[PDB]
Amino acid sequence: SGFRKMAFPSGKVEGCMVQVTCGTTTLNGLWLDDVVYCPRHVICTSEDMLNPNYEDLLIRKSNHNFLVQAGNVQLRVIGHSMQNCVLKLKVDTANPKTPKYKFVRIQPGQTFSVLACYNGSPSGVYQCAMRPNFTIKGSFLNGSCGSVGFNIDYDCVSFCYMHHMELPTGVHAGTDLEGNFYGPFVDRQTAQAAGTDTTITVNVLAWLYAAVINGDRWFLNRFTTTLNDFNLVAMKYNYEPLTQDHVDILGPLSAQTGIAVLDMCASLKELLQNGMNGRTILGSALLEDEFTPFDVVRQCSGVT
Amino acid sequence: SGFRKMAFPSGKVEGCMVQVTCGTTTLNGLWLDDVVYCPRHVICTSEDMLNPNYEDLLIRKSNHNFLVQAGNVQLRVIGHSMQNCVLKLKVDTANPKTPKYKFVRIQPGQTFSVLACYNGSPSGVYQCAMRPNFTIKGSFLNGSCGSVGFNIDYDCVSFCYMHHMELPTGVHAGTDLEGNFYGPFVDRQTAQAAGTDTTITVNVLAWLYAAVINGDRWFLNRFTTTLNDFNLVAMKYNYEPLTQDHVDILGPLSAQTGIAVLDMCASLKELLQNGMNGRTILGSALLEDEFTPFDVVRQCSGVT
Numbered sequence: 001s002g003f004r005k006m007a008f009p010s011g012k013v014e015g016c017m018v019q020v021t022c023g024t025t026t027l028n029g030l031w032l033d034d035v036v037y038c039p040r041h042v043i044c045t046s047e048d049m050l051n052p053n054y055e056d057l058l059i060r061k062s063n064h065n066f067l068v069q070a071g072n073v074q075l076r077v078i079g080h081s082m083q084n085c086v087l088k089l090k091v092d093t094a095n096p097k098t099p100k101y102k103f104v105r106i107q108p109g110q111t112f113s114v115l116a117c118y119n120g121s122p123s124g125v126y127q128c129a130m131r132p133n134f135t136i137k138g139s140f141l142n143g144s145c146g147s148v149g150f151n152i153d154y155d156c157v158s159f160c161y162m163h164h165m166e167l168p169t170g171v172h173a174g175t176d177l178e179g180n181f182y183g184p185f186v187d188r189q190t191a192q193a194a195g196t197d198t199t200i201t202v203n204v205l206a207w208l209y210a211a212v213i214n215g216d217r218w219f220l221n222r223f224t225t226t227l228n229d230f231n232l233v234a235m236k237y238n239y240e241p242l243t244q245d246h247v248d249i250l251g252p253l254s255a256q257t258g259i260a261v262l263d264m265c266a267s268l269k270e271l272l273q274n275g276m277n278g279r280t281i282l283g284s285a286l287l288e289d290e291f292t293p294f295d296v297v298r299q300c301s302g303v304t
Numbered sequence: 305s306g307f308r309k310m311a312f313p314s315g316k317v318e319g320c321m322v323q324v325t326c327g328t329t330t331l332n333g334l335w336l337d338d339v340v341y342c343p344r345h346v347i348c349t350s351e352d353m354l355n356p357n358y359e360d361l362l363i364r365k366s367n368h369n370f371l372v373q374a375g376n377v378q379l380r381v382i383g384h385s386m387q388n389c390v391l392k393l394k395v396d397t398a399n400p401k402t403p404k405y406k407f408v409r410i411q412p413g414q415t416f417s418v419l420a421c422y423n424g425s426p427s428g429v430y431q432c433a434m435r436p437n438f439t440i441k442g443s444f445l446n447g448s449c450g451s452v453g454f455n456i457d458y459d460c461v462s463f464c465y466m467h468h469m470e471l472p473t474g475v476h477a478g479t480d481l482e483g484n485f486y487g488p489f490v491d492r493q494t495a496q497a498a499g500t501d502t503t504i505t506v507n508v509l510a511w512l513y514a515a516v517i518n519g520d521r522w523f524l525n526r527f528t529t530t531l532n533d534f535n536l537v538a539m540k541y542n543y544e545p546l547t548q549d550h551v552d553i554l555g556p557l558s559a560q561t562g563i564a565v566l567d568m569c570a571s572l573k574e575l576l577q578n579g580m581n582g583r584t585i586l587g588s589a590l591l592e593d594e595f596t597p598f599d600v601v602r603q604c605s606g607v608t
């Protein structure tokens with residue numbers, strides 16, 4: 001019993017982190033096979049970041065200008081290329097700790113683990129979600145760029161995020177491992193305002209199922225609703241519309257608990273309209289939306 | 305910027321987890337040098353757990369009855385002994401992945417990372433605190449016993465917790481790595497009620513400093529207090545008494561922010577008396593008490 005905000009074990013990713021320095025800029029790189037992936041803004045000064053022309057800045061860089069250090073051992077850079085907003089540094093040594101991996105581009109509402117790193121050295125691991133406005137709410141200081149987000153399926157690491165930017169509002173933006181930003185964000189120090197940070201409704205419902213499984217049941221009520229009626233309330237409270245696809249995804253949790261999805265929606269509707277009245281659910285005083293239905297199943301079944 | 309409930313990177317501990325089976329009971333063991341540490345209740349049936357005589361049960365066990373598997377490779381058990389509530393299984397092979405380590409016995413209010421494991425296989429990592437009633441609020445299913453709690457100082461793992469028990473109230477009890485339970489708990493399936501789960505005041509104050517550093521400032525007020533006056537309010541709200549030792553420990557955060565500890569206590573007093581009024585601090589609607597002053601400094605400075 002018990003339900004915690006749980007990250008994936010980070011060892012397989014720790015074995016991939018390196019330091020990348022270009023001139024006076026040091027950040028983190030991801031070493032998989034004989035390629036090191038890092039943000040392309042490693043080539044910028046903070047002055048450059050105001051209005052960078054990355055193709056023009058990169059012309060002034062040679063392989064020997066990219067200093068790549070794995071622990072206290074230097075890697076030899078034998079090529080470099082820019083792909084969207086990432087640099088690929090070809091090294092002469094395959095990472096011996098390369099896990100089975102994939103690059104995936106996640107959808108808003110999906111969760112992942114971040115291995116926060118500085119100078120190629122892991123500092124901490126925590127669980128994130130891709131927000132509906134394509135930001136993440138991370139914990140990133142100067143030097144953390146190139147830290148990555150990932151999911152693990154048994155022995156396969158699916159890398160989905162690389163950290164690039166903090167918005168003036170202190171939320172975070174980054175790319176997939178093909179170097180395409182999530183959302184509209186760019187690797188330029190300019191006005192970038194985030195849109196509405198809506199609540200991920202299917203994730204709140206998953207978490208309420210988690211709560212019932214783990215014995216927190218006070219919020220269950222005598223009511224039901226419909227998707228359309230629920231969605232009128234979701235809209236008012238800046239929750240994402242619930243779709244039949246979401247209802248289908250919650251089927252296993254419905255089955256396990258015997259609480260119909262629309263009955264849990266009626267519980268959530270009352271919690272939105274009435275608040276918590278100073279009560280808590282799984283140790284939270286607000287409705288948690290950074291567990292997916294798959295997260296709740298995995299944690300509630302003990303998947304390794 | 306940003307402040308997250310962050311666990312230590314878990315790789316150094318992942319490299320130590322093994323499966324231990326005795327008869328029909330499988331749980332996790334910690335392999336350091338040529339010793340495997342596990343809960344002594346590995347020798348019990350669930351029937352046994354009602355009234356176990358561990359010395360008598362252990363007489364019926366031989367080295368060859370303790371099946372220890374590290375990944376898919378079997379370890380040879382060449383001795384066993386009981387130390388308090390843990391078994392030490394002497395194996396013929398030193399763990400090649402043994403990190404620098406220590407065994408530490410933590411104080412209530414101290415935080416640590418848990419690597420939840422099943423059948424010797426890591427499932428997840430999360431951050432815990434030792435509660436003032438010597439329970440922890442974990443996420444542990446059947447098979448998770450022998451999962452461990454730890455802190456990392458650069459390259460040294462300080463192991464402080466091994467999981468043994470879930471109380472009928474769904475909170476968790478365990479031992480240090482010498483096999484001594486935290487608090488009054490025993491490895492018997494019997495009536496064990498936890499005492500008051502008081503709030504760790506010094507940790508709440510650390511977290512309010514974290515909030516100010518990361519730009520959440522609405523709760524700062526025009527007031528101050530004294531330790532004695534604050535403590536009258538702490539008592540009423542089932543907060544731990546704040547001591548001068550705690551004030552001293554918060555000195556660096558006071559210095560960094562320029563907010564005197566007693567001024568932050570007056571902010572906390574008002575939050576206790578007035579509640580949050582539907583507002584949030586670092587994404588929480590309640591006062592978070594599972595970050596220590598050292599955690600806040602570490603996360604706010606990017607220690608690796």
Ligand SMILES: COC(=O)Nc1sc(C)nc1-c1ccccc1
Pocket residue numbers: 035078079080081082088089090
């Ligand atoms: C467009 O630039 C390159 O292809 N540069 C070179 S030269 C070399 C010997 N390898 C690369 C290379 C290969 C894979 C990934 C990145 C770089």
Ligand SMILES: COC(=O)Nc1sc(C)nc1-c1ccccc1
Pocket residue numbers: 339382383384385386392393394
């Ligand atoms: C009290 O029982 C033992 O000392 N048993 C044996 S016999 C052996 C060859 N080693 C041990 C041993 C050594 C260290 C840790 C646990 C066991």
